[PDB]
Design a protein around this ligand. Structure first.
Ligand SMILES: Nc1nc2c(ncn2[C@@H]2O[C@H](COP(=O)(O)OP(=O)(O)O)[C@@H](O)[C@H]2O)c(=O)[nH]1
Ligand SMILES: COC(=O)Nc1nc2ccc(C(=O)c3ccccc3)cc2[nH]1
Ligand SMILES: [Ca+2]
Ligand SMILES: [Mg+2]
Ligand SMILES: [Mg+2]
Lengths: 421, 59
């Protein structure tokens, strides 16, 4: 029945994950008690993809993970806190101290088996498991360190299941600690090996969008998260609602990932949130760099593949025409050796508070700008071995950092190979 | 994780030993300092016996 199993690790992961379930629970007519109260059977046609059916109640197939209880205690008392299965809250007490080694090797190792037990119980009750999705940040310790540990354990036990991630990349503009480039560099290599899709959500881009476009003088993490939950809703629209597409995770990945390591996507959304947008405006916005959440200029690279889903009632002859006009405008920014690498899909159901919207999924080589940014911040500290004691104190060796640095530089050069090809 | 356990245990071990050696070295030094002081005072007591003996002879 094409089930998906959702995991959210750490502070960031649980806070964007909670908002994701709030958004789609509303789209599917599920209330904070898990009871259906919608006006269309389309809301329920693919409800099983993300929800288990209990007293006619729908329970998210979601596992909430953290190494400290704070953020999950806040989720349990949040708006939709009661719909999550209580047994799927798996948390420790010591915290991860924004330390990848604590999440990946010490504190996280003590908790990981417990998480996998819940993952197994959820996977066992799946008629046909599509795969997994993980929400997390790469700049902390739990989501980054333990999240990538979980991904490695899940691939060992489920090697033939898709693993996709929504990964929040750190930025000095929106930063908690200076060690974030260390944690992100260590995590990226894990994702290079063990995920089929990784949506690169850059906090720098989310901030710039909140400040310059949405005119929010002082964005909060909550403001950044409204952009993420909205993007996640769109990216999963074709899996959750009937329409043109009925592809599972594997088929979606096959047509988007031409090379196994270049699976890091630049997501986008339009309209950025009374005048309903025209189709030309939706199309022009979702290709504008200002609507992209990776803080990479697509004009500095080339698209390997592009997928875009349009939601709402609209003329699709008009969308096809506009997609042609924007491709002509950006003709030199698409590789010429993957024919017909720009695909479009439709869903009649729009998201809440919008008559129509569009979600952009780009597999662009410009994403190398993000990895180069992280690599430069990494090296700035690693030249002087600054703040390394937090990691060597947990058993890590200098060599592991040198290898992560080289792996990052190899990833960047592989993108530059296909940007010139 | 084994390396982390080994480093913490080795730090605990070397501190326990470094302290045990400092506290014993200090005990010996203080005991020697006080022993030398008294030995000088006993030497004076002996010198006082010689003085009182030297008086008796003159009588
Ligand atoms: N978008 C977003 N980013 C967050 C949030 N909380 C923390 N971050 C980012 O995540 C990183 C800190 O990781 P965090 O999730 O707090 O650490 P963890 O709990 O150990 O996984 C930093 O780069 C923060 O900018 C959040 O609610 N939203
Ligand atoms: C839980 O993780 C995911 O949702 N992964 C994921 N990968 C995707 C790739 C493409 C699309 C589309 O909407 C689409 C639009 C037009 C043509 C073809 C596809 C949706 C995806 N969702
Ligand atoms: Ca412990
Ligand atoms: Mg935090
Ligand atoms: Mg066990």
């Amino acid at each position: 029945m094409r089930e998906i199993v959702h995991i959210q690790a750490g502070q960031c992961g649980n806070q964007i994950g909670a908002k994701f379930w709030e958004v789609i629970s509303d789209e599917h007519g599920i209330d904070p008690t898990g009871s259906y109260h919608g006006d269309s059977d389309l809301q329920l046609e693919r409800i099983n993809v993300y929800y288990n059916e209990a007293g006619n109640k729908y329970v998210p197939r979601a596992i909430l993970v953290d190494l400290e209880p704070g953020t999950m205690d806040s989720v349990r008392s949040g708006p939709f806190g009661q719909i999550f299965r209580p047994d799927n809250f798996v948390f420790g007490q010591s915290g991860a101290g924004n330390n990848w080694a604590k999440g990946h090797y010490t504190e996280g190792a003590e908790l990981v088996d417990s998480v996998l037990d819940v993952v197994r119980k959820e996977s066992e009750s799946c008629d046909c498991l599509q795969g997994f999705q993980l929400t997390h940040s790469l700049g902390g310790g739990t989501g980054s360190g333990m999240g990538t540990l979980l991904i490695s354990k899940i691939r060992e036990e489920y090697p033939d299941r898709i693993m996709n991630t929504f990964s929040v990349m750190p930025s000095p503009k929106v930063s908690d600690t200076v060690v974030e480039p260390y944690n992100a560099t260590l995590s990226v290599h894990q994702l290079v090996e063990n995920t089929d899709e990784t949506y690169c959500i850059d906090n720098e881009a989310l901030y710039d969008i909140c400040f310059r476009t949405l005119k929010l003088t002082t964005p909060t993490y909550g403001d950044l998260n409204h952009l993420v939950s909205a993007t996640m809703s769109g990216v999963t629209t074709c899996l959750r609602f009937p329409g043109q597409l009925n592809a599972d995770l594997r088929k979606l990945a096959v047509n988007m990932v031409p090379f196994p390591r270049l699976h890091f996507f630049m997501p986008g959304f339009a309209p950025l949130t009374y005048r309903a947008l025209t189709v030309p405006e939706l199309t022009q916005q979702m290709f504008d760099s200002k609507n992209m959440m990776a803080a990479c200029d697509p004009r500095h690279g080339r698209y390997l593949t592009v997928a875009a889903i349009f939601r709402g009632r609209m003329s699709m002859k008009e969308v096809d025409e506009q997609m042609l006009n924007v491709q002509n405008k950006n003709s030199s920014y698409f590789v010429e050796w993957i024919p017909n690498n720009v695909k479009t899909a439709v869903c009649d159901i729009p998201p809440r508070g919008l008559k129509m919207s569009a979600t952009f999924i780009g597999n662009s080589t410009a994403i190398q700008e993000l990895f180069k940014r992280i690599s430069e911040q990494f090296t700035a500290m690693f030249r002087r071995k600054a703040f390394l004691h937090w990691y060597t104190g947990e058993g890590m060796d200098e060599m592991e950092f040198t290898e992560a640095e080289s792996n990052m530089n190899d990833l960047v050069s592989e993108y530059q190979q296909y940007q010139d090809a | 994780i084994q390396k982390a356990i080994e480093e913490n245990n080795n730090f605990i071990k070397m501190a326990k030993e470094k302290l045990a050696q400092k506290m014993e070295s200090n005990k010996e030094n203080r005991e020697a300092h006080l022993a030398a002081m008294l030995e000088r005072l006993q030497e004076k007591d002996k010198h006082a016996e010689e003085v009182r003996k030297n008086k008796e002879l003159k009588e």
